[PDB]
Paper text:
Factor XI (FXI) has an important role in thrombin generation in the amplification phase of the coagulation process. Inhibition of activated FXI (FXIa) should decrease thrombin generation in the amplification phase, but not in the initiation phase, and thus yield an antithrombotic and profibrinolytic effect with minimal risk of bleeding (see reviews). To improve crystallisability, the quadruple mutant (Ser75Ala, Lys78Ala, Thr97Ala and Cys123Ser), first reported by Jin et al., was generated. The mutated residues in this construct (FXIa CD) are located at least 16 Å from the catalytic residue Ser195 and the alterations are therefore not anticipated to impact ligand binding in the active site.
Several of the fragment hit compounds were only weakly basic, such as aminopyridines and aminoquinolines, and neutral compounds, such as chloroquinolinones and the known p-chlorophenyltetrazoles, were also identified. Two prioritized fragment hits, 6-chloro-3,4-dihydro-1H-quinolin-2-one and 4-methylquinolin-6-amine are shown in Fig. 5. To our knowledge, 5 is a novel serine protease P1 structure, and 6 is here described for the first time to bind FXIa. The crystal structures of compounds 5 and 6 in complex with FXIa were solved to 2.0 and 1.7 Å resolution, respectively, and the fragments could be unambiguously placed in the electron density maps. The two fragments display distinct binding modes as depicted in Fig. 5. Fragment 5 displayed a FXIa IC50 of 140 μM. The chloro atom is directed almost perpendicular to the aromatic ring of Tyr228 and is located at a distance of 3.8 Å to the closest carbon atom of the phenyl ring. This chloro atom replaces a highly conserved water molecule and its position is similar to the chloro atom in chloro-phenyl containing P1s of FXIa, thrombin and FXa inhibitor. The chloroquinolinone compound 5 picks up an additional interaction with FXIa, i.e. the quinolinone NH group forms a 2.7 Å hydrogen bond with the backbone carbonyl of Gly218. Notably, the chloroquinolinone is slightly more potent than benzamidine, compound 7, despite the fact that the former is neutral and does not form polar interactions with Asp189. This suggests that the chloroquinolinone P1 is a promising FXIa fragment inhibitor, with potential to be expanded and developed into an orally active drug.
Residue numbers in the entry:
A (entry chain A), B (entry chain A): 16 to 37, 37A, 37B, 37C, 37D, 38 to 48, 51 to 59, 59A, ...
Write the structure that this text describes.
């Protein structure tokens, strides 16, 4: 996260850090708890990931220093990528992780509500992007979970800023005209969380941008409400 | 290493990478093979290291990507720190690691010769500092082992550049007046290797500097020849 601040412990209790153990263990991407066995994240996080066995999901984390060889984690039983996903910049940047065991909800770990189709008209004015990613384009993973409040921009505005792309209604953009606050490398798959009528909603999934926090380059997020049917379909038993 | 280049595989076969496994595994410092059970490194590398059990020594490495959970390593049986060591900037920045098993020498892993007391008069003109450390003061560990050729400076010259320190005859300095090539964070404990009469000698141990590669700030190294008695004393059986 560029231009953000350190989070209060457990103020984003749906935020997980997804590690890979290959070759040695490291943070890979963010994610969000959406059900007892389900993390919502970005499809592009799994480039070159050939098996779920090398994945570990860590809930209830503020600082990456909390994560040691003795720290409990959730194994991944299945990676589900959207069948239309090819790459972040063409959309469908969405995946589910089915965990090997169920999360026991507590104050430090609980699920975020999915956006309602009836809230598409809702102007979300209180949105935050969170993660352990870079503070600048060339940097490293941050110890403490960072947050930044970022205004949504309209899809029309966002299209003017990415003239070589197709910004579709399955994407949602957020940023300041002058830049300075944004997601960056390592934040992908994490939430864009918007508080509306005292409830937190998972409005977007951190997906891509041109650089990080640049003037006139809004962050591009997966527009989660366009995928609630897909999520329902994919999270049913057998 | 600042201002260096990628090494040829195994051109520094005495160079090891010392990892810590706590909290998760990462490169800690460089080191040099000086005997079948012995790595020479910097005392200051062990700040906060309470047990040798969390140390792993990896020989025969060019790229950090080679190191995975299935990669063979040497355990550390004992950390021996100079009894006069307090901190890098006051000298005695030297330690031995006694390995749990013996290294089998090969083309990719073999010991570097210690400098001779008779070579103190020798003007070493072919010296190289090597490691996986930062390319700039705020950066991260590099994948490929870097090298940089660096001229030794006299202890008199070095003292003029560090007026708030005591540069003693137990230190040796190396750098360009204009800066630009130097060791940096993560290179400590590694060799300053000087080739003389077709033989490589371990002249220094990467220890400290003010920043990395700055104008008029030579790298400061442990002057290994001042410690050959100590090394002999500490590497004897029982
Ligand atoms: O480099 C990056 C990687 C991800 C990324 C994600 C958003 Cl949402 C914005 C900028 C970004 N920049
Ligand atoms: O930050 C650092 C750390 C180690 C270090 C070592 C030498 Cl030899 C020179 C500069 C240095 N700068």
């Amino acid at each position: 996260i560029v231009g953000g601040t350190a989070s209060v412990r457990g103020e984003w209790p749906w935020q997980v850090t997804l590690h890979t153990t290959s070759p040695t263990q490291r943070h890979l991407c963010g994610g969000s708890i959406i059900g007892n066995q389900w993390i919502l994240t970005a499809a592009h996080c799994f480039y070159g990931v050939e098996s779920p066995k090398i994945l570990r999901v860590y809930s209830g984390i503020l600082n990456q220093a909390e994560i040691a060889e003795d720290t409990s984690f959730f194994g991944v039983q299945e990676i589900i990528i959207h069948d239309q996903y090819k790459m972040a910049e063409s959309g469908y940047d969405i995946a589910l992780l089915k965990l090997e065991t169920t999360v026991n909800y507590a104050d430090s770990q609980r699920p975020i509500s999915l956006p309602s189709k009836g809230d598409r008209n809702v102007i979300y004015t209180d949105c935050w992007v969170t993660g352990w990613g870079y503070r600048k384009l060339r940097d490293k993973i941050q110890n403490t979970l960072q947050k930044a409040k970022i205004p949504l921009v309209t899809n029309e505005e966002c299209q003017k800023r990415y003239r070589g792309h197709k910004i579709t209604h399955k994407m949602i953009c957020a940023g300041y005209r002058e830049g300075g606050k944004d997601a960056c490398k390592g934040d992908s798959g994490g939430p864009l969380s918007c508080k509306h009528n005292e409830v937190w909603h998972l409005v977007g999934i951190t997906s891509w941008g041109e650089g990080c926090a640049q003037r006139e380059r809004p962050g591009v997020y997966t527009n989660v409400v366009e995928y609630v049917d897909w999520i329902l379909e994919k999270t049913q038993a057998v």
